[PDB]
Design a protein around this ligand. Sequence first.
Ligand SMILES: CC(C)CCC[C@@H](C)[C@H]1CC[C@H]2[C@@H]3CC=C4C[C@@H](OC(=O)CCC(=O)O)CC[C@]4(C)[C@H]3CC[C@]12C
Ligand SMILES: CC(C)CCC[C@@H](C)[C@H]1CC[C@H]2[C@@H]3CC=C4C[C@@H](OC(=O)CCC(=O)O)CC[C@]4(C)[C@H]3CC[C@]12C
Ligand SMILES: CC(C)CCC[C@@H](C)[C@H]1CC[C@H]2[C@@H]3CC=C4C[C@@H](OC(=O)CCC(=O)O)CC[C@]4(C)[C@H]3CC[C@]12C
Ligand SMILES: CC(C)CCC[C@@H](C)[C@H]1CC[C@H]2[C@@H]3CC=C4C[C@@H](OC(=O)CCC(=O)O)CC[C@]4(C)[C@H]3CC[C@]12C
Ligand SMILES: CC(C)CCC[C@@H](C)[C@H]1CC[C@H]2[C@@H]3CC=C4C[C@@H](OC(=O)CCC(=O)O)CC[C@]4(C)[C@H]3CC[C@]12C
Ligand SMILES: Nc1ncnc2c1ncn2[C@@H]1O[C@H](COP(=O)(O)OP(=O)(O)OP(=O)(O)O)[C@@H](O)[C@H]1O
Ligand SMILES: Nc1ncnc2c1ncn2[C@@H]1O[C@H](COP(=O)(O)OP(=O)(O)OP(=O)(O)O)[C@@H](O)[C@H]1O
Ligand SMILES: [Mg+2]
Ligand SMILES: [Mg+2]
Length: 1176
Amino acid sequence: SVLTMFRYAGWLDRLYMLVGTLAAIIHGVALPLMMLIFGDMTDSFASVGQVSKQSTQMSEADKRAMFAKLEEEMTTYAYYYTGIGAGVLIVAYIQVSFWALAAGRQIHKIRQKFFHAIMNQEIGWFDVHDVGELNTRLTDDVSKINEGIGDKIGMFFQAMATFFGGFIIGFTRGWKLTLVILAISPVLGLSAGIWAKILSSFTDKELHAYAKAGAVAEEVLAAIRTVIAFGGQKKELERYNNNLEEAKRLGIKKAITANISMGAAFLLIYASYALAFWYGTSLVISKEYSIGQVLTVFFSVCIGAFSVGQASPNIEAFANARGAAYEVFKIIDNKPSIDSFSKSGHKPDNIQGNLEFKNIHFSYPSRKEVQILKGLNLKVKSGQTVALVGNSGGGKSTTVQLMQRLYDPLDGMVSIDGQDIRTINVRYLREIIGVVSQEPVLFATTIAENIRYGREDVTMDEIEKAVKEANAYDFIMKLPHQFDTLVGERGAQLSGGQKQRIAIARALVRNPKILLLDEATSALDTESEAVVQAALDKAREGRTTIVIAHRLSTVRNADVIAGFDGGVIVEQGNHDELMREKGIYFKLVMTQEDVPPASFWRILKLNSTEWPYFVVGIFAAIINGGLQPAFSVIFSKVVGVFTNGGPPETQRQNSNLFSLLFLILGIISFITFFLQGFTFGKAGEILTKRLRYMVFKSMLRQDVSWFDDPKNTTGALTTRLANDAAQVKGATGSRLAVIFQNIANLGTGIIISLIYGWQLTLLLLAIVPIIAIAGVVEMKMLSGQALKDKKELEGSGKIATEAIENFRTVVSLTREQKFETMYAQSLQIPYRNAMKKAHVFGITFSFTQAMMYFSYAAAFRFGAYLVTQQLMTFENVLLVFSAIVFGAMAVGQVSSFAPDYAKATVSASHIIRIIEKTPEIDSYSTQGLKPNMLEGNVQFSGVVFNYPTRPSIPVLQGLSLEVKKGQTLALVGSSGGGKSTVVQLLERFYDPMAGSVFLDGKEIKQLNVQWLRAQLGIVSQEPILFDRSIAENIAYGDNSRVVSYEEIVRAAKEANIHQFIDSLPDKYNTRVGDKGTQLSGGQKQRIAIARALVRQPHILLLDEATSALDTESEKVVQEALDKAREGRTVIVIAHRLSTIQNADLIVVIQNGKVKEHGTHQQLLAQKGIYFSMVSV
Ligand SMILES: CC(C)CCC[C@@H](C)[C@H]1CC[C@H]2[C@@H]3CC=C4C[C@@H](OC(=O)CCC(=O)O)CC[C@]4(C)[C@H]3CC[C@]12C
Ligand SMILES: CC(C)CCC[C@@H](C)[C@H]1CC[C@H]2[C@@H]3CC=C4C[C@@H](OC(=O)CCC(=O)O)CC[C@]4(C)[C@H]3CC[C@]12C
Ligand SMILES: CC(C)CCC[C@@H](C)[C@H]1CC[C@H]2[C@@H]3CC=C4C[C@@H](OC(=O)CCC(=O)O)CC[C@]4(C)[C@H]3CC[C@]12C
Ligand SMILES: CC(C)CCC[C@@H](C)[C@H]1CC[C@H]2[C@@H]3CC=C4C[C@@H](OC(=O)CCC(=O)O)CC[C@]4(C)[C@H]3CC[C@]12C
Ligand SMILES: CC(C)CCC[C@@H](C)[C@H]1CC[C@H]2[C@@H]3CC=C4C[C@@H](OC(=O)CCC(=O)O)CC[C@]4(C)[C@H]3CC[C@]12C
Ligand SMILES: Nc1ncnc2c1ncn2[C@@H]1O[C@H](COP(=O)(O)OP(=O)(O)OP(=O)(O)O)[C@@H](O)[C@H]1O
Ligand SMILES: Nc1ncnc2c1ncn2[C@@H]1O[C@H](COP(=O)(O)OP(=O)(O)OP(=O)(O)O)[C@@H](O)[C@H]1O
Ligand SMILES: [Mg+2]
Ligand SMILES: [Mg+2]
């Protein structure tokens, strides 16, 4: 389970990682070979050169000779170092490039496999789980795995190789002593293991919190219109904030525990240093060990221990990857019972559909206590039409879902031609099914592509034939871009009837043997319904149909009608047989970018409130970062005091003071490392929480037209927020802390060299530009593709989210493979850029390391000229060189910061742009008139409006209408005529191009936006709920006020939904599904009606609030509204005749214009359009 990742390596990734590990081992061993010349060899000649120099030895004749000898040996070692520089160049690329190449390939396969696993789950699995977390897992956790399985493992292996090189060199030069030094290595190993395990657990919890935050964001952004209409921005921001607070506290805990562990680790390592130094002093005083021997072993083990210490961020990244892999591979390992990707099962050649439901018992997985079907029995013969009639929630849509095997029955059997559908192949079974759902859902693509999801290889002639049969041909040809016009998310940029007709055509192109039509004409007008019904009846002979309808005209011509009661069929037979049996059908019928370079810095300004955390951390960065180079200087005293120590007692005292100093340095290192990690980590967590909060608030501030933009889809927005926050976080925190430490390491070197040797400091002037340019050029590349990589990423996150939100449609259309192919295609450009980065970062790291070895060689050469010319002491040369190597050991980590900084800068620029964005219709604005009283007069005067996504099409052409308090306005007309546009404009979702809208004679642009929307109670054409309880969904109707239980129950009673909630276990605490899919269509609509009514609004806007209701439920809701007619102004959009005649005034809208206005009797008196609609 620990090594559950690397599952998809394969032979190529296994060889990329074997060869890279060998290259890392060679690169690591290159550094103890550097130390091999110290202590002895070069330093054997040195403590021989001046400490053991003769006071005078014909120095005028032979000191020049040993200086030349040391000139000659230094030149040889300079050649050796140039060779090592070339070798390190080669091995450093292979290490870094191959490791990132393998990480990139594995991450590509992991993303594909995780998406495939999500697409393989059952409908019940989606019902039980909160799938809004899945896109956050796709974007955040996979990137967390990527940073722990890549070149960081190569760096860890290089550090381990350097440590082992010091290990062998110490034992070769002198054992028993390096045993004392390295006997504490198991303690550090256990400490690192515990550290990593705690980091992994904290990462798992933090990713859970971030996934919950992403689920909240996805739910809110998907239903943004409902949030805006009901003024829910503050509360949704608050739920998002609660998840962010959980993530922030987890991150702070992680930082504290990790840093206290690391500080204890360094306290232990310096205590070990002190004990080892005492032991070495004892040995060297005993004369068992020469001073050079202890020098060599100490220095060799010291560099290896320093490499191990610098390896810690790699272990942290590996632990974070392990913490991230948990949920991803848990989902990947899940196996569904109803497998749609299985190749098993029967595929009959010729099917003459004989549908049978025998003794069907079903309870939904998420509400298993509730029985929906109790021994349901139904038979459908080939070529026959069955009409399922009954009250809302009876289980008709449940039967439709069971027919396509979205769930298995608890008891009983669903059979085709006497064969159990469990034994049939799932994909084959669902491919011969054409289905139109109760509330059709489209995809964010073109009309032609939406229809092509029904059948992939359908030609344009068959698409035209289907849209002619679906009565969608005319409006498609009328609008520009023809079939290539792109519909909104879920088809939101079409009218309800247009979307329904598109879904009908999508079902028709399948050429299905079995057609399920769950209220396929709910959003249609009378003429469209009639023509679509004629088209369907034209081809009823070769196919079996199960139709659900609340319109009696469609049920009239059905071959057989089945009535639902108590979960069973009570009446089945012919229309005349049903009239004669006087059943339930009897009662039913009599009820007739710029990317500014300073952007990242600006983001850091947003963290300025945490300035005291930074300064302390900066100090903690200056001290310990300056300690590693200064470790040389004091160590120069360590030998220097000992060599001139003289008597054994004086040397013993000096060495025990040195050991005490080492212990003090360990205490200081514990303190400073804990502070440097903790302060920067806490500042980073605070910054990330603040940035996420601000970005979500800005997104909730934006206009409706902004969400209508094709770039601003729900998946794109969620991916944008998560990715920008993560990329900015990548450059802040402990990462920035270690960068500051490394900068201190590199910085103290200049000063200490300047005191000790100034000429050699000129090399830093020659060494730093050459590295620096190598840094900036990569800056230009990794930035340029990052702007692309994010954009493409926003595409991929779109495809996944559209697939996860619309999963039931995808499964019904058998389009899991198509969406997987699109998701794989959207990953191509990022995957190629990941392969390009491997070589680019491999080359850069390789060049930087060579340059260090090349500078080392130059220093040794430069050093000799100085010594052969008596310009500097050799001891000073060695001290300066040790300073340079200790300072430069962190240059690799500094260069590794380049990929993070560019991504952070780009994401910072995007975050700054989104926060500063100001909408045209600002919902957060406190400006605007708030009238003391509201009379309820609504007027439209010459309103002309074009939707921003399709500005060439005029939707409203001088629309004018009036409605007063106590009056009911009934907007009727054909589909797509602009009825919902009026309600959207009254909510100030958009502003009209011309004309005006008045509320009590005051133009609504002058009014406060929130105040204006608070006077409105809206029921949208296709209502959307939240993944919350019924009580919370109703109480959403009046935010900024705590709605009591009594008011919620009263609203539910007014909406005729109270009885269903009360009978339901958990009652008002029953969690509804995502967007209300775990309810009946009529139940969800009634919940929406209760949500609008609990507000008690002055203007009630009902956009077909009774489309999915029963006749009895419609009657109850209508009488409830009638009892509260006076005292409010009501605007009603309805295709039902019975809801229109009681309205005070009726407006017929065609082509954005009023054609007929007046009462029911007046419109019936003249033989106009209204009479035509009535007669049909
Ligand atoms: C020690 C250094 C100097 C030599 C390089 C190590 C080689 C032993 C390895 C590591 C890189 C490998 C190559 C990396 C790239 C490819 C492409 C790769 O192409 C595919 O995988 C194609 C797609 C498919 O096969 O379906 C085939 C192996 C090959 C030639 C590899 C062959 C074996 C190589 C040369
Ligand atoms: C011997 C010294 C001079 C070092 C230089 C070696 C290169 C000249 C060779 C050895 C390593 C090879 C590379 C090893 C791996 C890759 C990545 C490989 O792409 C992948 O990662 C495969 C999967 C994918 O591309 O999707 C394409 C070939 C390439 C660049 C190989 C091209 C030839 C390279 C660079
Ligand atoms: C502390 C951090 C920075 C470094 C950790 C290094 C090791 C813990 C990693 C690095 C490379 C990994 C290996 C890379 C590839 C494979 C092959 C792969 O083998 C399988 O078991 C495959 C299973 C399958 O294919 O179904 C996964 C395990 C293994 C040995 C991995 C085991 C864990 C290893 C040794
Ligand atoms: C884009 C550029 C800057 C990158 C390529 C840099 C190389 C061309 C440089 C980097 C370090 C240089 C080396 C630094 C030091 C030495 C040692 C030097 O040794 C002697 O002259 C000593 C001879 C003696 O006294 O016995 C010879 C040149 C050499 C190999 C240099 C050769 C040229 C090197 C490899
Ligand atoms: C860090 C690298 C990658 C870029 C910069 C390289 C320089 C720092 C190197 C390359 C050429 C080197 C020089 C090449 C030759 C000489 C002459 C050399 O003279 C001798 O020792 C020769 C015998 C004699 O003294 O007569 C003294 C060092 C010096 C100045 C070297 C000093 C270091 C230099 C300037
Ligand atoms: N996914 C689900 N999880 C739990 N219960 C569900 C789910 N879908 C529907 N139900 C419940 O199952 C019952 C049957 O509802 P169903 O959707 O079958 O109604 P319908 O008869 O087709 O009615 P209408 O046409 O009014 O929507 C209701 O109590 C409903 O809330
Ligand atoms: N967000 C949008 N972007 C672009 N065009 C839109 C958008 N919403 C609706 N339209 C288009 O505006 C026109 C009127 O749509 P509207 O929803 O107002 O019609 P309607 O009369 O309510 O229709 P129906 O009875 O079918 O629900 C149609 O052509 C529709 O496709
Ligand atoms: Mg239904
Ligand atoms: Mg509409």
